[PDB]
Each structure stands twice: as C-alpha cells, then as structure tokens.
Amino acid sequence: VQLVESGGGVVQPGRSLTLSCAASGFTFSNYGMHWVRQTPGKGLAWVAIIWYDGSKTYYEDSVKGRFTISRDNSKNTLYLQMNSLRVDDTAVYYCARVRHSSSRHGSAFDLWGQGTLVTVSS
C-alpha cells in the first residue's frame, strides 16, 4: 500500500506545473482521490477531488478554473495540472485515498503520500 507523488520543483508566477501521483500495491481504479495542500504556518487545506472515474470533480473556491485534476486508471496515476500559479500557492501537496465506507457518505483519507514541495517565487 504505497502512494508516491512527484513533479515538484520551483516555478515563476503565472507558469504552469503538473504533478503526478503513482499508486502502488492496491487497486487504484477503485478509489477516489484528493489533493491536499500544506502551507507551513497553517493546517492542511483541501484542493480537489476525483470521483473514481473522472466523472465528477470538485475544487476549492480559490483554485477553481486554474487547477485541473484528472486520473489515469490504466497506469495508476493522478494528475493535478496547475495553470497561472501565484505566490499564494506555495505549499506541500499530498494525495489522499478515500477510505472504503459501507454507506453513501464517503470516509476519511487513510493513505497519504509523502508530498512534493511546490515553490512559486521570483
């Protein structure tokens, strides 16, 4: 049960950077995933959700229209494509796997990756 991020680095404001999240050891195509930011000095903040098929996605209000989350069930990977980055968006990005739940109300995020630092500065 392994979940590894990638794609981090340093970019200038307004430039586009794309992340990936390679899953390992479990059926990736069976779970809905989240992306969660951690800006030091604050707690975790949610970013996007992907609905196990690509059919439904929901974003935070501050990233709507700039972040495009998509998944690839064939290679067990996620993708959070960022466009028009700002100095606000520098944080550590985590993947989250939604726990299996015997209901219709979802569940917490059991498996979290190690995160890759995204730095936006000039």
Binding site: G32, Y58, H105, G106
Partner: protein, 72 residues
C-alpha cells in the same frame, strides 16, 4: 379572613398578561413528537451533495450488459 368567596372571581382579567416568563422553559418534553409531518419535505436540498461516497461500489452488476456497442 376565613369567610371570603373562594370561587374564581369570574370578572377577572382575561387578556394576554404581557409579563410572563419569556425564557426557554428548560423543563419541556424532549421526545420524538410522534405526530409530526411524515412526508417528503418538498424544499429539501435539490443539489448534488458533493460529500458522497466516491468509491467503487463493490456490489454492482457484474453481468455482460447485453445492450453494448455491437460494432467494431
């Protein structure tokens, strides 16, 4: 005065008595109220409920789906 009309004084004030305890009455009936509207609540949230189970639905139709694309 033991001898005084112990009846109700029918000519009393029948009005609303504005100085009544307007507080919450902490001793009330905290139960189910069985005679409550058992209906559909037409004004319920007609939206999508974003916080719903995004998982795989392990118990789904595993059959062949006879109505599938019969072309190339």
């Amino acid at each position: 005065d033991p001898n005084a009309n112990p009846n109700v004084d029918p000519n009393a004030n029948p009005n609303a008595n504005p100085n009544a305890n307007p507080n919450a009455n902490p001793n009330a009936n905290p139960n189910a109220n069985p005679n409550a509207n058992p209906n559909a609540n037409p004004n319920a949230n007609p939206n999508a409920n974003p916080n719903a189970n995004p998982n795989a639905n392990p118990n789904a139709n595993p059959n062949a789906n006879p109505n599938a694309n019969p072309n190339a």
